[PDB]
Amino acid sequence: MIVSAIAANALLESVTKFHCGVIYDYSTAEYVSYRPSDFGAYLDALEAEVARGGLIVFHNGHKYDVPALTKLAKLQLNREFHLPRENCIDTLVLSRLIHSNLKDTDMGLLRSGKLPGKRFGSHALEAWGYRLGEMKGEYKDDFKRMLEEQGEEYVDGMEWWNFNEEMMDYNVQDVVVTKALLEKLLSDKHYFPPEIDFTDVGYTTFWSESLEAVDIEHRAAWLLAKQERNGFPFDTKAIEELYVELAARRSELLRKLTETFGSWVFNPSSRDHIQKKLQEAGWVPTKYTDKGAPVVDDEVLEGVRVDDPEKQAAIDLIKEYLMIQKRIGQSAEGDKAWLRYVAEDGKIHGSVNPNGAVTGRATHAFPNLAQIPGVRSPYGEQCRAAFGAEHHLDGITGKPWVQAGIDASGLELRCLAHFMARFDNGEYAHEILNGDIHTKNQIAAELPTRDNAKTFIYGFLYGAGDEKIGQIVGAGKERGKELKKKFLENTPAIAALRESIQQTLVESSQWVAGEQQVKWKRRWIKGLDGRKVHVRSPHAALNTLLQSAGALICKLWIIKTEEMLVEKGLKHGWDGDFAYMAWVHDEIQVGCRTEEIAQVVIETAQEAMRWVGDHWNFRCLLDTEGKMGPNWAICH
Amino acid sequence: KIIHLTDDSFDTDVLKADGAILVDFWAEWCGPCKMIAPILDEIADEYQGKLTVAKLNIDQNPGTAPKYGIRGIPTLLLFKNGEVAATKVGALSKGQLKEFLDANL
Numbered sequence A: 001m002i003v004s005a006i007a008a009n010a011l012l013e014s015v016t017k018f019h020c021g022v023i024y025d026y027s028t029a030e031y032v033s034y035r036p037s038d039f040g041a042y043l044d045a046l047e048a049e050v051a052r053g054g055l056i057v058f059h060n061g062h063k064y065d066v067p068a069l070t071k072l073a074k075l076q077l078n079r080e081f082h083l084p085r086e087n088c089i090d091t092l093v094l095s096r097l098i099h100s101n102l103k104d105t106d107m108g109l110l111r112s113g114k115l116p117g118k119r120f121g122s123h124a125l126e127a128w129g130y131r132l133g134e135m136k137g138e139y140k141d142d143f144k145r146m147l148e149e150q151g152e153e154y155v156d157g158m159e160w161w162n163f164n165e166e167m168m169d170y171n172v173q174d175v176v177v178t179k180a181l182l183e184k185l186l187s188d189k190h191y192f193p194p195e196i197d198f199t200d201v202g203y204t205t206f207w208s209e210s211l212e213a214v215d216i217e218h219r220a221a222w223l224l225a226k227q228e229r230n231g232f233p234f235d236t237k238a239i240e241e242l243y244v245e246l247a248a249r250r251s252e253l254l255r256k257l258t259e260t261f262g263s264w265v266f267n268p269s270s271r272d273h274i275q276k277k278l279q280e281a282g283w284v285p286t287k288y289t290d291k292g293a294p295v296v297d298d299e300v301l302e303g304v305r306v307d308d309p310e311k312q313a314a315i316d317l318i319k320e321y322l323m324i325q326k327r328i329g330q331s332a333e334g335d336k337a338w339l340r341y342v343a344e345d346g347k348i349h350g351s352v353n354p355n356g357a358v359t360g361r362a363t364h365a366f367p368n369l370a371q372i373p374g375v376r377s378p379y380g381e382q383c384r385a386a387f388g389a390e391h392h393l394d395g396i397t398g399k400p401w402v403q404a405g406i407d408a409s410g411l412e413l414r415c416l417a418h419f420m421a422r423f424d425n426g427e428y429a430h431e432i433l434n435g436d437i438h439t440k441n442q443i444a445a446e447l448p449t450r451d452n453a454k455t456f457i458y459g460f461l462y463g464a465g466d467e468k469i470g471q472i473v474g475a476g477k478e479r480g481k482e483l484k485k486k487f488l489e490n491t492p493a494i495a496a497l498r499e500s501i502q503q504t505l506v507e508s509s510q511w512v513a514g515e516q517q518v519k520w521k522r523r524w525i526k527g528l529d530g531r532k533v534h535v536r537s538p539h540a541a542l543n544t545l546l547q548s549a550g551a552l553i554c555k556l557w558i559i560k561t562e563e564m565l566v567e568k569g570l571k572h573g574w575d576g577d578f579a580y581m582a583w584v585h586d587e588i589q590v591g592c593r594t595e596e597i598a599q600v601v602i603e604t605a606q607e608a609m610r611w612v613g614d615h616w617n618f619r620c621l622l623d624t625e626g627k628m629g630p631n632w633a634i635c636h
Numbered sequence B: 001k002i003i004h005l006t007d008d009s010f011d012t013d014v015l016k017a018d019g020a021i022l023v024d025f026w027a028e029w030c031g032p033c034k035m036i037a038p039i040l041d042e043i044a045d046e047y048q049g050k051l052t053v054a055k056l057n058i059d060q061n062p063g064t065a066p067k068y069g070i071r072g073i074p075t076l077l078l079f080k081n082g083e084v085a086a087t088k089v090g091a092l093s094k095g096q097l098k099e100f101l102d103a104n105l
Helices: A037-051 A061-075 A091-098 A104-114 A125-132 A139-148 A166-187 A203-209 A212-230 A236-261 A299-302 A307-332 A380-385 A413-422 A428-432 A437-445 A450-462 A483-492 A492-500 A542-568 A594-615 B010-015 B031-046 B094-104
Strands: A002-008 A019-025 A030-034 A057-058 A351-353 A363-365 A402-408 A506-508 A577-582 A589-593 A624-629 B021-026 B052-055 B077-081 B083-089
Touching: A002 A037, A002 A061, A019 A037, A019 A166, A030 A037, A030 A166, A037 A057, A037 A061, A037 A166, A057 A061, A057 A166, A061 A212, A091 A166, A091 A212, A125 A166, A125 A413, A125 A483, A166 A236, A212 A351, A212 A542, A212 A577, A236 A307, A236 A380, A299 A307, A299 A380, A402 A542, A402 A594, A413 A428, A413 A450, A413 A492, A428 A437, A428 A492, A437 A450, A437 A483, A450 A483, A450 A542, A483 A492, A483 B021, A542 A577, A542 A589, A542 A594, A577 A594, A589 A594, B010 B021, B010 B052, B021 B031, B031 B052, B031 B077, B077 B094
Parallel strands: A002 A057, B021 B052
Antiparallel strands: A002 A019, A019 A030, A351 A363, A402 A589, A402 A624, A577 A589, B021 B077, B077 B083
């Protein structure tokens, strides 16, 4: 096993030159420093550990280091360099796996004065140096202050322009933190057994003798990192033709909404507006917002009735206006608007954090690819059309690629059937397969319509009170208790589900001054792969359990699907046959060169989904549904 | 003896009115205007024949004030044949107004 970290001139998207890199070998117990004229030997040193079947330790290597060293080797050395996914370890991923509950952990770290306020809960290399006590300083700061006593100034991120001896010393600093952080993660015996000193093993022993969660997360991080580099093809012209239809509508709406109110200036998106208005048109607020004056409150606006017809009719103009700002602020004027993120390949490369959550459901940002308005939401149809494989060319024919959208068919309710198959012997599970589970929940909870059962089952499982439940039948917090208790009597298994599991984490509970001081057995629920999935209050926790199952199911699902597609003969990327464009929890969007490839993609995903269920011996049956088409509005 | 102006009746009562028209660009909730409102009442009474005194509440007539560049209130505008002859912003006195108008009269 070797440990390293590198320093380049820029980010993964325009890096040009390799500066330095340090390699600590556990077998040699000694570091080795590299320099710009030593880039070639650096790649061989990594190849040598691959030949031995050892391991290579990087921080964020799956997402940056490994693809950058592949990219740098092509333009600088003109050689092909591809670190095998099996021979790579990412401390960042393990940190996100092992220490997903950092947010609490920092409380004691704050008391010490050892952890910066800007580096709270962060999983960056330097942020961990302060946690372990290895930060003698930071390269960026030993650069700025020393530039003063040299004359010349500082430009935002110029410390990486040129190879400097201070970078070479802080390049070591990043390596020793990676090593100590690795051993800090290897010292967690829940994930890494004591019987195996993983610091001196081959890759073959590392993955299997480690917890299964260790393997998936590195497979998940590697695949999704490929997805970011693949990117999502984007029709720039289409979104441009929308801002025109929106800005014109905004100005036309703004004009009509300035005839209704004067000044001494009507504001599009201000909170000091409705606060000044409606309570002058004859509207007395039903619900307020905190220390002073109610917020925008989109909810009440639908029900605001004022005796002024013009003011009343203007309410719906406000409803549209605010929404127009939302799409615009997401598609054009936002600091993280889509038009700002289109790369020079005609694609949007939205990033994704693998286990950036307690449960394992990922997070998307810059731009949040997982919040694009739905086709049911206004103008979402046009929005979804802007994200499509058709908006990509082709390596040869040029004929637009076809998109394949496959989602997990009702994963949440089937996950519920799996954990409750422990109490009903597959009763509820068969109701899924037999169909109309929302019809049974309707009968069990005594709801008038099937749609009311749908909004019930999800709210009840996740800890909704009685207001959302009461508003279903046009009531308040009153109606809810009898709706929840009746469902419990008609579905004992669900009640029995929360019995053994919720009493598996407690010995006895106790209320002290309004705070439950529960004596825990373990403040963490085990996931499908043995990882720690904490919760908070034992009053529900089920929501955490089900979402953990679902997110862990899809994570393995998208891994095996790609694994089978590669095994069948398909090549991953825009230069091969298919390319992952976006992963959104229970649905995925895959680009495909021909319709024939897309059909295989759909079938393989179903084959992988049954494979996952057999793998973890899932009590319930998992199915998926695929849609073929040009873009995303079609795949959903 | 005081004229109330709207936006519609600002064109006829002021712009098409021969003679000096003194307009108070005031508002419901402002301080220096509440003090001079008694002042205009006696001036409107004394300058009967000479001056027409008028009041415009810019909270209900808010389209006129921007047109004449109303910076602060109360803003007194001496219209002379649709044109603004002299303007004064804020509070004031009667003897100083007398000196002011008779200089323009």
